[PDB]
């Protein structure tokens, strides 16, 4: 198991640019899989207001869709205003 | 298709930008989107030969919307009549069309 380490240290001493490039490449490949903030990027891009989400009609049916904009119902943003 | 592998596997790979009335980034609708939607939903599985005599009114309205040929012809005779009436001197121009008025927002 010393041959791979000797080749890695020899390339590190001689031409370290491809070693740094492949290490940063593998870090960029594996670091979204490690980091817990990968799932917050889709939350950011969903919870941004970007167009008008239009009001819907009601027959007294759904309780989750609010009437006042300052109601506690609906998808809140305490994970973005405080965090 | 010839090999209908997208319909076989059920996954759209080039099919979600096929016409003008496909889904758009950040929900911004194209021009003549309602005309294209009513043209496809009037040609909804009718067939090509029956649809070109059936929804010819909806295609003619959508083609008129998209290329605006009779609209530009109408504005062309309106502008030619404006040049003829300004050379005649009969048409006093309104100040709303001249632009010398306070505008509403």
């Amino acid at each position: 198991a010393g041959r791979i380490s000797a080749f890695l240290k020899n390339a590190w001493a001689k031409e370290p640019v491809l070693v740094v490039s492949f290490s940063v490449w593998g870090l960029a490949i594996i670091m979204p899989m490690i980091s817990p903030y990968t799932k917050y990027a889709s939350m950011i891009n969903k919870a941004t207001p970007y167009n008008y989400p239009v009001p819907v009609r009601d027959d007294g049916n759904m309780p989750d869709v609010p009437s006042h904009p300052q109601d506690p119902l609906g998808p809140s943003l305490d994970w973005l205003k405080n965090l | 298709p010839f090999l209908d592998i997208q319909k076989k596997l059920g996954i759209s790979l080039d099919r979600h930008f096929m016409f003008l009335s496909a889904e758009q980034p950040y929900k911004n609708a194209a021009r003549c989107h309602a005309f294209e939607k009513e043209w496809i939903e009037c040609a909804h599985g009718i067939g090509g030969t029956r649809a070109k005599k059936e929804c010819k009114i909806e295609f003619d309205d959508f083609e008129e919307c998209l290329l605006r040929y009779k609209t530009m012809r109408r504005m062309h005779d309106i502008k030619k009549q404006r040049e003829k009436l300004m050379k005649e001197g009969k048409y006093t121009p309104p100040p709303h069309h001249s632009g010398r008025e306070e505008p509403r927002p």
Partner: protein, 170 residues
């Protein structure tokens, strides 16, 4: 006010010179005059990305196309637009054919193609006034997310292009 028609007539003149085919060193100059004209046309139309993107990709391609003209396909006594007199007579013939075409095209059709005070008014069809995304950049940004097969096939075109060009130039 007649910006797109004046620029499109200049594009007709530049593609006419490229079509009348000089030494290709001079043809690169005429085609990049047409490229600056087309970049300014898309930037005057509302594509703030597409004209500068074709100026970047076209200046960068046409640089080494120009280098291949002045290396490989060169000639001791070349032909510009003013060198050969059949080319010069064809140039003034194409110029008088273009202005005779617009002089018969404002008169035959009786539609809104060319009018002396009614052209340029039918250029912008509809952009949303209160909307926020109307430039061309976010639609070509959507090929990463919606139209993913476009980026798959373009990356495979460039990968196969590298391998195909190594096999050609070997």
């Amino acid at each position: 006010n007649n910006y797109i028609f004046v620029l499109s007539s200049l594009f007709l003149v530049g593609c006419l010179g490229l079509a009348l085919k000089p030494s290709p060193i001079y043809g690169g100059l005429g085609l990049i005059v047409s490229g600056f004209v087309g970049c300014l046309m898309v930037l005057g139309f509302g594509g703030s990305f597409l004209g500068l993107m074709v100026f970047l990709i076209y200046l960068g391609g046409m640089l080494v196309v120009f280098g291949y003209t002045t290396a490989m396909a060169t000639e001791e006594y070349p032909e510009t637009w003013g060198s050969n007199w059949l080319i010069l007579g064809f140039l003034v013939l194409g110029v008088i054919m273009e202005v005779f075409l617009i002089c018969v095209l404002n008169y035959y059709d009786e539609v809104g193609v060319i009018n002396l005070d009614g052209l340029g008014d039918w250029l912008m069809y509809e952009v949303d006034d209160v909307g926020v995304m109307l430039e061309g950049g976010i639609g070509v940004a959507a090929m990463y997310s919606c139209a993913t097969w476009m980026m798959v096939v373009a990356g495979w075109s460039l990968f196969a292009g590298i391998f195909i060009i190594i096999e050609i130039t070997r």
